[PDB]
């Protein structure tokens, strides 16, 4: 039985367990474009719910990188057709952040996006009802959020780790301060 | 740039890039509970679509596995809550070829499972409208279904592999009448 | 507080309103293509989840009709983009009941397909986790399978009504032996 | 045939036929909780595909109304199951828009975000592929934004209504200023 829930994008070159660095089959692994955490998306809840309640799967991780083809893509004002409606759900979370990235010089503002993205979709997990009600029943269950970098292997525990509801906020809160200083 | 998607299953022990041997970057890679490819998911349709339509990939590979979790889970008649609605489609599967899994030695059904699932995606994913088009407007886009096993370590192309509608039928109807085949040890 | 969940389709001409003739707001309302209970989607599981849970109501109704648009255009073998996906599912259920829609003249077969795709959505209701869990916890609750005919609003409990799993399955086997006798 | 799509929430007691008085046959009708138009959801989003580019409809109509049993679950913080994942888009919106419903009387938020919602859906409804490439290649689609109340049993439409890309900006901005204008009974 694997002890970590991986939810990783699909253009990242690194596998999970080059990184984690965990032994086979300690890790559970869903991939999907810009690793989100869509509320409403069944794929992704279903292996969330099927992690936490039936696998009992105490780490969850949401890893983004730097240089991500699918952040580009959403930044990227293009018809790609059925992927941009996918990509969407990026483009409200460079809106919600505006003035932040507004204030950055153009090339570096994907990765702030990166950086961004993976706090937010850390929210949306820790906001669904499957990790709503683990916490409100007591079970042990964290939340991490990942950016790593292809220039050298470099991994960093995004403001983002989550025990709790409360932690939750916080850990989101700080974490958005902090991309905010430049 | 990446040549390949490959769709496989949250379970799986090994990587896609171990599994090819392809340096990874010629992986495009969608992981979910039993490689499914279901014709309404937005998330799996997506990757695809994207793959296809802007990455220009020329080959999906759809890649089960034995020993699974995933069609276990499918299989055991439990009430395991949001997930069991994700693997009834394994379940219209599992009834869909009842007879040739019933004519069958309990312990070897979740494998043949597994190799029936394989065939099955790769059919709703050569029927998605995405590849479909693909397919019409003459672009190059090989579909695979492919299946591992650990005891040995290696693979075997499940019969399915196509490249045009015409070729979809023909191979996924021939995998499943390879697979009809049963070595009496059932 | 309504005492029905009415899942209809799209270009179904007629009110449910009217069918039923139930007061208003005894009634809940979904309405899809082609009027399905798809496993996974999202907007139809909600619906009913909430329905069943939270509204606590007794009675859910699937109601088909002849002369359906979205029942044709899954017949047709054409191009419509997006949609197409959606009206798989149908032609599945065309698949599976092949020998008999096969033997029948053509013009009456779209609606013998919406007679059968009525019986084949009440059952992925009845197998849903929330029905199911409804019904093995003690719960009234009564799933219903209509084809309504244009040709003077008539409405037929097309074999399917279930109160329990047992009777699910003998009222779906017996509809589907029932519209096999020409 | 039909000239308008009718996106309605699965609540409101009234008919699109009755809300309009178009006569049945015109309209083709969804429904949904708290009438939403979500990025990513195959239903909705399909529904919409198919009236616009196969039924060719020139209306979208998304419609919400007070005294919504959606919009007062979504701001109820309970434990409802399933369905609050479905719900905290509205959950979403109500965050994005917490200063203006907070400098407001408690009793009158729920109508406040009720309009606040219709606004948002149709600007991710003009948002959707669909519509976008419609509008790109000169189709005449006009996508507007109503609400209704029981207590005098009329609508009025949100500032919302829009035929171009150019067009939705300025409206969802704008229903947003209107929105935002407070007369002082909170
Ligand atoms: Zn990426
Ligand atoms: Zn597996
Ligand atoms: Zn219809
Ligand atoms: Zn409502």
Redesign the pocket.
């Given at each position: 039985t694997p002890h970590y829930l991986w939810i990783g994008?699909?253009?990242?070159r690194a596998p999970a367990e080059k990184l984690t660095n965990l032994e086979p089959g300690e890790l559970f692994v869903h991939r999907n474009?810009?690793?989100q955490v869509i509320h409403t998306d069944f794929n992704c809840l279903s292996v969330v719910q099927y992690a936490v309640d039936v696998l009992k799967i105490e780490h969850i991780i949401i890893c983004?990188?730097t240089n991500?083809?699918?952040?580009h893509a959403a930044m990227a004002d293009k018809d790609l057709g059925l992927i941009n409606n996918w990509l969407l759900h990026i483009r409200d979370i460079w809106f919600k952040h505006g003035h932040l990235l507004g204030k950055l010089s153009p090339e570096k503002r994907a990765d702030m996006l990166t950086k961004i993205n993976v706090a937010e979709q850390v929210y949306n997990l820790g906001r669904t009802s499957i990790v709503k009600s683990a916490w409100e029943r007591g079970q042990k269950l964290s939340l991490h959020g990942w950016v790593y970098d292809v220039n050298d292997g470099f991994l960093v525990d995004q403001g983002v780790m989550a025990t709790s509801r409360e932690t939750l906020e916080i850990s989101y809160r700080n974490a958005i301060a902090r991309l905010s200083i430049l």
């Open positions: 994008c699909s253009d990242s474009v810009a690793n983004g990188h991500c083809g699918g952040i």
